[PDB]
Amino acid sequence: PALYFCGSIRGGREDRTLYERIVSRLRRFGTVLTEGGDRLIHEQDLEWLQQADVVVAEVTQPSLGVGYELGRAVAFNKRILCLFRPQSGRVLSAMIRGAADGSRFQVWDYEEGEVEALLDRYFE
Amino acid sequence: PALYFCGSIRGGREDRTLYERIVSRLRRFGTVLTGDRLIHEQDLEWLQQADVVVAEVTQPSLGVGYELGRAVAFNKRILCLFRPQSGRVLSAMIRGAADGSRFQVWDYEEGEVEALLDRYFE
Lengths: 124, 122
Ligand SMILES: O=P(O)(O)OC[C@H]1CN(Cc2cncc(CO)c2)C[C@@H]1O
Ligand SMILES: O=P(O)(O)OC[C@H]1CN(Cc2cncc(CO)c2)C[C@@H]1O
Hints:
Subcellular location (chain A): Cytoplasm; Nucleus
Bound molecules: ligand A1BBF
Binding site for 5-hydroxymethyl-dUMP (chain A): 7, 9-11, 63, 65, 69, 93
GO molecular function (chain A): 5-hydroxymethyl-dUMP N-hydrolase activity; identical protein binding; protein homodimerization activity
Number of strands of chain A: 5
Number of helices of chain A: 5
Number of domains of chain A: 1
Strand order of the largest sheet of chain A: 2-1-3-4-5
Radius of gyration of chain A: 14 Å
Largest sheet of chain A: 5 strands, parallel
Organism (chain A): Homo sapiens
Oligomer: homodimer
Distance between the termini of chain A: 12 Å
CATH architecture of chain A: 3-Layer(aba) Sandwich
EC number (chain A): 3.2.2.-
Order of helices and strands of chain A: EHEHEHEHEH
CATH topology of chain A: Rossmann fold
């Protein structure tokens, strides 16, 4: 299983420690392809994105990059899991919340402390 | 001339005034189109029926980025407006998706937005 991980960087790194947690778990389930010059980045991740079997994304921290990766990932027909925290106070965008279909694209609300648990349940 | 605008909403509304300015100008030049699943499907419709997607991308937003991802995949023509005065560095997914031709990113100053839009639209 080849896994692509999306999570905010230039939109804010508020959740970096959580991203690391989320990635540490994914490496128990597969290789993680992720992690003028912005053109290299764009070009490289678009290739990794093409190769993934699951696209896992943390969508609390608003970010253009994460949004665009999801848009290209829907186009490529990839299987997509999004993770959102209602505790944050924000309201997930409707473009994300309503691209969900309940299987190929899923969106799960969670509390930050049980992310490993949830991850175990999805990749089983 | 069918026009789709995107700007931040559930990821921030600091630029609401500036969005109104862009929409007003957009209307000179053409038709402007602007449950959560209704919204996603209805918007994905206009996005498809569009001939050019204009996004203001100064403020980070999942939905503007998504819409942009889908428009690159609908090979639609795209123009992005970015404000260095915000102090943000724009996402590399946006600056680097650009090809100078069918996908453009222009850095402008808040005052000149009307002028930029006039140049873009002959
Ligand atoms: O928050 P961002 O920055 O807008 O997008 C964040 C997403 C886009 N990423 C690709 C990327 C990787 N290294 C630097 C950049 C510069 O942005 C972008 C991975 C991340 O999931
Ligand atoms: O900031 P957002 O919400 O993440 O995305 C912002 C873009 C998504 N919009 C579609 C939309 C329309 N009515 C409510 C919502 C609630 O999101 C969203 C147009 C806007 O260009």
